[PDB]
């Protein structure tokens, strides 16, 4: 439960699923700060914002953003990384911010546990290794290509994106957050 | 992600682990409302408090409190049910508040999936049924008696307390919340 042993997952957006807290974010910067879901995330982090930001009050060692690979999922991650870059910058600078890579494929092996691939390369690798081991797979429907997080059952979502020994996390750098901030400014101007 | 398909789990306290949001609560009523963890829970619910309470702004269909059976776990559940009874009463009245019953025992069957018991009666029943079916168990260490939520691995905690088809939930009635409020007042006076 301790901040050092605590993580906060922010699950985005309209196609959604060590202490692991979880908060949603569904989907004008002043209007976004008034949004209830945004307010809950900011409050849970416990640092305060802008000039009131206090790193010592950080409630979570890791902040993990989880969204779909599509434009809808990108839009929400862009929004949250911009809010963090503009009002809670040391969270990014000190390496607390991460992006969860959801699995792209589920390999439905006939008489064994299903395997999950995070890229086309891993899918091909796992398929070859499985067939070589003697595992069986249906050529027509044995490989499920995920379209969103909502397609996964809650148990497999945890196994693939939240289990620390299995999950694929990418650290958000200051340059990554600056690129999200630029993207936000471009889209607002459009 | 929709409020109707959303649940908020409040995991208590110092011995801790359909969209399922999760928030911690570790462990003078005016001082409690200023606490960051309490503020995050209230904010996530989205209704506001006291005269500002708006049922229409409720972000979660179910509010589930999960704590250890000991005095430490009871103290936190007493505190949160009191806050809900005093400042967010319709959440209890409208049947949104529940208590999660964590498993008391894990039956470590030798060559099959482990089973979980929520009472001494269920433990005895499952043990008899398993041995009758031909399942094997070690008489010395095969039955683990849980002392707290922190003893469970994250995956089994979800399977037993968060899976809607498996979990054991008890609805918090207005009388239940009134008894928690009385208990809080007695302990504060002590």
Numbering used by the authors:
A (entry chain A), B (entry chain A): 448 to 464, 474 to 483, 492 to 654
Recite the paper's sentences.
Mycobacterium tuberculosis DNA gyrase, an indispensable nanomachine involved in the regulation of DNA topology, is the only type II topoisomerase present in this organism and is hence the sole target for quinolone action, a crucial drug active against multidrug-resistant tuberculosis. DNA gyrase and topoisomerase IV consist of two subunits (GyrA and GyrB in DNA gyrase, ParC and ParE in topoisomerase IV), which form the catalytically active heterotetrameric complex (i.e. A2B2 and C2E2, respectively). The GyrB Toprim and GyrA breakage-reunion domains come from separate subunits and cooperatively form the enzyme core. The breakage-reunion domain contains the catalytic tyrosine responsible for the cleavage and religation of the DNA double helix.
